[PDB]
Design a protein around this nucleic acid. Structure first.
Ligand SMILES: [Mg+2]
Lengths: 195, 50, 139, 175, 191, 56
RNA sequence: CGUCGCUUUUUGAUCCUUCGAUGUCGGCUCUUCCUAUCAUUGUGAAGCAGAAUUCGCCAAGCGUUGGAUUGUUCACCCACU
RNA sequence: AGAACUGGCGCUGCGGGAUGAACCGAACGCCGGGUUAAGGCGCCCGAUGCCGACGCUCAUCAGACCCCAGAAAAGGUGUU
């Protein structure tokens, strides 16, 4: 149906290249919490080449021309857009299957979220080399919604403690509930053939 | 004046090396300029005394 | 934090490659990413395997620094590495993982029926542990 | 030479054609490292023509056999002498490796000369290779493995990406 | 080169006990407690043995700029041990020509309000890093004392005084006026 | 050392194409009957013949 | 004394495009861009006491005039800055 | 600007060089299956989604593939 990729710990182009391949193959991919996407190289280097992007402005009127987006949901969405054939109708239809959300909205906060170990910083960056966060390089360029997102992030996660608190309570029960067995005739085939 | 306080002032203002290329104000036992603009060059002269 | 090292005598498991799934005993490190290994009682002889292939276990052997095949063999079966590898929970997982892959179609029926059978018993009994816990807190 | 794959040590002998002036030439011998014996009996005429007045027209080879080591299991220290070419001039170079075989350490040289000094395989001439004994090594990277009861762990392990699923719910621990 | 490991040790005396949460270091001692995270530096820390209290910092393989930082770890730990038993005291003195520099302390040993620097009417209020204490010295002219547990907060505080007192648009080889640091000692002496 | 006889015949294939070829070397291939790419022919090895395979 | 470059705001060398035609000097008017920075901001160095100057650095945000002669670009002079 | 030798373009499509007269492969009746050359194989874009090997390198202007489309002398206790 729809796959949900949590975006923290991921590199920008390593994640957006895989997402752009899946979206051409018919799937519907939703990249969620794209404030914490990383990008390799230190912060000042990634900050300079984004400011070099901002002055890519057409001279005669900048209203027509390059639309420099500032939220990191649209920083990511534009990176996917350059890895899709978007001037064709095959790639117009591709970018409609991608819905990228900054933060985690309530249709997608109670789903289970997936990661891509191809694009993780821990996997792919050597640990002694520097990386920049997509959140605060969005903050330094005109994205004015960092504080009101990170307030809603810690409101989301405190409610996400109280669910996981009572979910590990329930599996402490059904593992104490299976202490009193009375069913070992059914353990016989599973232990013999991988429980 | 206070000539012992005169020495302690000059330790941070005069007792240093200047590079001929990056013009930086380094420390009296530098061999190279620390600034990248000169390419860490090693032509130093002492900061000129009054 | 770094509780198992490489060492002369460290028993490594082999994950992939042409000898995938057989133990080796590390004999000598040669250079930085290649180790000279062999398993005399487990059908893999003396050669240089990469460290990226091998999986370190918690078994050590006291044999000299790069001895012959005989002296490694005497250290292997005195300490009884092949039977102590049977009584570990990591070889029970590779045993169980290959029991599930050779699980035939008729056994996949017999697994299915007794799997839904024991989940009825737990779900009706974990309901009874719910049914008592609310009865603790109602007084 | 391209040095494709791992190299392979060859013993090549050969002698010039018996003239009406000279009968029974001395039948020289070399030690060629090459990926196969057709390249090996071509590299023989590269070095013999640099040292004697012999060439492929006025000579032949009378043996080209692969010579290989009397201990493929023992760990050995090889110090080798090089004559590579740089972009400015040409240099003499001593260089120490540590491998189970003579042909695998000279292969490890050509990988290293391309890595460190960008030196292509046509431009580097092996002068001599021999196994050396410890406490006569001078390179401290080879020297740091001379430790009875040597130990180290493996830090920060990474491998098997996309094979184990591209999409998982599971942040993979690096031990 | 990728060397086999190096290791510095740090001996700890009895009045200070280092516990470690991970690469974080927790140093409790006589005159307080302070902590640093070293979660950026990629090394293992190990305190070994009761009753002797030795810390063992060691870095597996590493290269030469990664081997440079194992000594950096233990010399930040030795300043956390010195600063929690002895403390840090950076005495500093005011150097002045014609104009006496008037330095007062406004908020309880935290803010320093410097006026009459070289005849200027603009006061200079320098707010310090939390954990240091301001003091006009005694039995000595024009001396200021800073006391604290952490060396990077005292010495940064000592630099904000000296940097605020900067002579501008002048020859700074004469006009040698400012409040410069003069001594690097401890709160408790001789331990 | 027994040195064997250097061989009497050779099988020669043409591995390059047709166009951009010097007139001497497309005369010898015309004399070796190697006109397309990937044609083979067994060739008597002689002093006159080995010197044709040096041109080509 | 050497010697190594850069730039295409000068002049040439060239003759690829344009001869069933690309309106050809200068001024006026107005816009935007470059830095190889005159001034202003922050700095570093002097054979920098102050004042006045000079040499460098991040720097093109913002300014860089009024006239007499000359068709002049250019030039030169007066005055302010 | 003007010669020599050979091949090309002009008279010539096609595969690769993003793009293209002349570069590198290869020359062409209309198709089906197989294989390749030059060139490639993150995603546009067919193919490394190989548990590839060994090193070198951090750039506040990185680098990145014949012709071909940007740099020298000099210099660096930057690392090898
Ligand atoms: Mg050619």
């Amino acid at each position: 149906q729809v796959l949900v990729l949590d975006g923290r710990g991921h590199l920008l182009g390593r994640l957006a290249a895989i997402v752009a391949k899946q979206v051409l193959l018919g799937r519907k991919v939703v990249v969620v919490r794209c404030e914490g996407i990383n990008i390799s190289g230190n912060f000042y280097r990634n900050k300079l080449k984004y400011l070099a992007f901002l002055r890519k402005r057409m001279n005669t009127n900048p209203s027509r021309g390059p639309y420099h987006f500032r939220a990191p949901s649209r920083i990511f969405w534009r990176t996917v857009r350059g890895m899709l054939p978007h001037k064709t109708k095959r790639g117009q239809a591709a970018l409609d299957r991608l819905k990228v959300f900054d933060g985690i909205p309530p249709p997608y906060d109670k789903k289970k979220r997936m990661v891509v170990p191809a694009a993780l910083k821990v996997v792919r960056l050597k640990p002694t080399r520097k990386f920049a966060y997509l959140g605060r390089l969005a903050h330094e360029v005109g994205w004015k919604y960092q504080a009101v997102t990170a307030t809603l992030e810690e409101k989301r996660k405190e409610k996400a403690k109280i669910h996981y608190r009572k979910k590990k309570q329930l599996m402490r029960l059904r593992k104490q509930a299976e202490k009193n067995v009375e069913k070992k005739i059914d353990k016989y085939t599973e232990v013999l053939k991988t429980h | 004046i206070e000539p012992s306080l005169r020495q302690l002032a000059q330790k941070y203002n005069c007792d240093k090396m200047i590079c001929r290329k990056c013009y930086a104000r380094l420390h009296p036992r530098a061999v190279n300029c620390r600034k990248k603009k000169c390419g860490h060059t090693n032509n130093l002269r002492p900061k000129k005394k009054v | 934090v770094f509780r198992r090292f490489v060492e002369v005598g460290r028993v490594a498991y082999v994950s992939f490659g042409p000898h995938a799934g057989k133990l080796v005993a590390i004999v000598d490190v040669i250079d930085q990413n290649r180790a000279l290994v062999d398993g005399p009682c487990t059908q893999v002889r003396r050669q240089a395997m990469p460290f990226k292939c091998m999986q370190l276990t918690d078994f050590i052997l006291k044999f000299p620094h790069s001895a012959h095949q005989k002296y490694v063999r005497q250290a292997w079966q005195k300490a009884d590495i092949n039977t102590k590898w049977a009584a570990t929970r990591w070889a029970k997982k590779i045993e169980a993982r290959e029991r599930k892959a050779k699980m035939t179609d008729f056994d996949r029926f017999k697994v299915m029926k007794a799997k839904k059978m024991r989940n009825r018993i737990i779900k009706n009994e974990v309901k009874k542990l719910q049914k008592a816990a609310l009865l603790k807190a109602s007084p | 030479m391209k040095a494709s794959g791992t190299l392979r040590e060859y013993k090549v002998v050969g002698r010039c054609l018996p003239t009406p002036k000279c009968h029974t030439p001395p039948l020289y011998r070399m030690r060629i490292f090459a990926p196969n014996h057709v390249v090996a009996k071509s590299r023989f005429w590269y070095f013999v023509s640099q040292l004697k007045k012999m060439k492929k027209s006025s000579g032949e080879i009378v043996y080209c056999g692969q010579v290989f080591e009397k201990s493929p299991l023992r760990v050995k220290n090889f110090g080798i002498w090089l004559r590579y070419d740089s972009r400015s001039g040409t240099h003499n170079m001593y260089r120490e490796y540590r491998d189970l075989t003579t042909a695998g350490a000279v292969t490890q040289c050509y990988r290293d000369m391309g890595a460190r000094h960008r030196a292509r395989a046509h431009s580097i001439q092996i002068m001599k290779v021999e196994e050396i004994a410890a406490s006569k090594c001078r390179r401290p990277a080879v020297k740091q493995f001379h430790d009875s009861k040597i130990k180290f762990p493996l830090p920060h392990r990474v491998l098997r990406r996309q094979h184990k699923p591209r999409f998982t719910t599971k942040r993979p621990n690096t031990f | 080169m990728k060397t086999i490991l190096s290791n510095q040790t740090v001996d700890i005396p009895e009045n200070v006990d280092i516990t470690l949460k991970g690469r974080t270091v927790i140093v409790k001692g006589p005159r307080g407690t302070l902590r640093r995270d070293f979660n950026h530096i990629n090394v293992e820390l190990s305190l070994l043995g009761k009753k002797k209290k030795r810390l063992r910092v060691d870095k597996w393989w590493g290269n030469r700029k990664e081997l440079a930082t194992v000594r950096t770890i233990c010399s930040h730990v030795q300043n956390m041990i010195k600063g929690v038993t002895l403390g840090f005291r950076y005495k500093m003195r005011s150097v002045y020509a014609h104009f006496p520099i008037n330095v007062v302390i406004q908020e309880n040993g935290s803010l320093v309000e410097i006026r009459n620097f070289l005849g200027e009417k603009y006061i200079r209020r320098v707010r310090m890093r939390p954990g240091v204490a301001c003091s006009v010295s005694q039995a000595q002219k024009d001396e200021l004392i800073l006391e604290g547990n952490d060396i990077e907060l005292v010495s940064n505080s000592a630099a904000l005084i000296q940097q605020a007192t900067t002579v501008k648009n002048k020859d700074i080889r004469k006009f040698l006026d400012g409040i410069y640091v003069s001594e690097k000692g401890t709160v408790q002496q001789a331990d | 050392f027994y040195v064997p006889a250097e061989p009497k015949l050779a099988f020669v294939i043409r591995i390059r194409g047709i166009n951009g070829v010097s007139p001497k070397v497309r005369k010898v291939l015309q004399l070796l009957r190697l006109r397309q790419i990937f044609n083979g022919t067994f060739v008597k090895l002689n002093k006159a013949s080995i010197n044709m395979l040096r041109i080509v």
